[PDB]
Design a protein around this ligand. Structure first.
Ligand SMILES: [Cl-]
Ligand SMILES: [Cl-]
Ligand code: NA
Ligand code: NA
Lengths: 128, 128, 126
């Protein structure tokens, strides 16, 4: 009903952690150093895979401090429950300053967003 | 009641499609458009829809376009009572204009579960 | 009955507003601020809130501002346990500075349902 499975794909990967007991997400960590160019984008390696619980998808959502201080926003971010490859992190840098990331830094958070994933499509002439 | 209602405004629209376990339904451009490099545009879809009770319709980014073309969705909160055309706002963070053709996939629709009837109460102290 | 508890930290603050089938609650600036072209800024709201059990508060964009001002919301993950002032991170992707006056609607709060009590298992194979 709600188990979060992690595959650690190299020794460089870190298991996602909660920052508080009641935090929405799990911190996601870089497994390789990378720079996110100013007004640019990059893709951060994590060397992890996961299966989110039934009735969810995994949202790769931004860390607030990196937003406020470094101009960091996450891109992409919809991890399907069926998805089984390495979860990498798209970052946009909306600042004037390159953003240096080291192996071991928290770069994003994972939120298990509850969804309706079994809707019946009904095509209709008009809406209410 | 977990029915997604779809209204097609043109033979140029495509009914959204979903993998039974994917989080999202594909959203297709109904008309050509280029998103300028370091800029934005609004993609026509010629569809309207009503999401299931208990959700809203989140217009979320396609992962491929994020990585390949620096494309992020903007706006993207579709209320359950919205009956107009769902137009897709796209930011292009890359250095290349992103050319979109009719029938191209440009976003995905996630039926996000929400609390949409919380009572708003004003209190002295959250801490209490 | 589920409850969103709001604290008005000053007389400049506005209780958020929500139609019954709308997804979000409007969030208002409590102070003037300009968001620079191709830049970002932090909007003061002078409110704090506690979202219902099973949710976090997502600070999400207004659609009309996205379209006409290039405004995207940044950060926006407000944990249920957060009791500080909720400031709104705005990215301006347009070539015009965006002017915000106290009392302007700048964002929306959605009470996103989530699994906040999942247990991590580690596997060789997904
Ligand atoms: Cl800067
Ligand atoms: Cl580029
Ligand atoms: Na579901
Ligand atoms: Na906004």
């Amino acid at each position: 009903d709600k188990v979060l499975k992690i595959q650690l794909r190299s020794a460089s990967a870190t298991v996602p952690t909660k920052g508080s007991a009641t935090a929405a997400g799990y911190d996601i960590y870089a497994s390789q150093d990378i720079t996110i160019p100013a007004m640019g984008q990059g893709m951060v390696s994590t060397d992890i895979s996961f299966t989110v619980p039934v009735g969810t998808y995994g949202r790769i959502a931004p860390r607030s401090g990196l937003a406020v201080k470094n101009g960091i926003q996450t891109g992409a971010g919809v991890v399907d429950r069926d998805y089984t490859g390495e979860v990498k992190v798209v970052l946009f840098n909306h600042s004037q300053r390159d953003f240096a990331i080291k192996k071991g830094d928290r770069v994003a958070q994972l939120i298990l967003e509850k969804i309706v994933d079994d809707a019946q499509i009904v095509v209709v002439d008009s809406l209410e």
